């Protein structure tokens, strides 16, 4: 059960940027086994995207938690940020608050500055780890 | 492996 660069190459293949966002891709599934690439329409049944949706470990007060999130990736990819969202299952709920908003979307400086070659998806996700280790985006329905 | 989260606090 692993996804070869073959079936990553073929989700990719309407990017502007195609082995960039592979190279990428394979280096953030490598190392985060819980993300895993998926193609789907985003928004009209004609806009195919590639995204990455699993989870992630954030330590939250002394225990980790394994925080479901999708990160879509564009089809500037490389170039321009991916839109990334927290994907609550039914035994959570979102926290609205600083870096998520209403509909799950989150913000991060890391984000809004967003610059390639510099900014890449490991970076984007080490600070994910941090801020969420801080603030939660999800909580579990007591 | 399953998602997971911190209860409220």
Redesign the interface.
Known sequence: SAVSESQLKKMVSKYKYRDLTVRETVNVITLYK?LKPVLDSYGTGSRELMNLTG?IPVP??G?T????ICLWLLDTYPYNPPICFV???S??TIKTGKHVDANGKIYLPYLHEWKHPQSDLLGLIQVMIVVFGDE?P???R? | ?9
């Open positions: 819980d989870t939250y007060r225990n938690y394994n925080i479901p994907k609550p299952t035994s959570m939660p999800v909580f579990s007591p | 492996p399953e998602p997971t989260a911190p209860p409220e606090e």
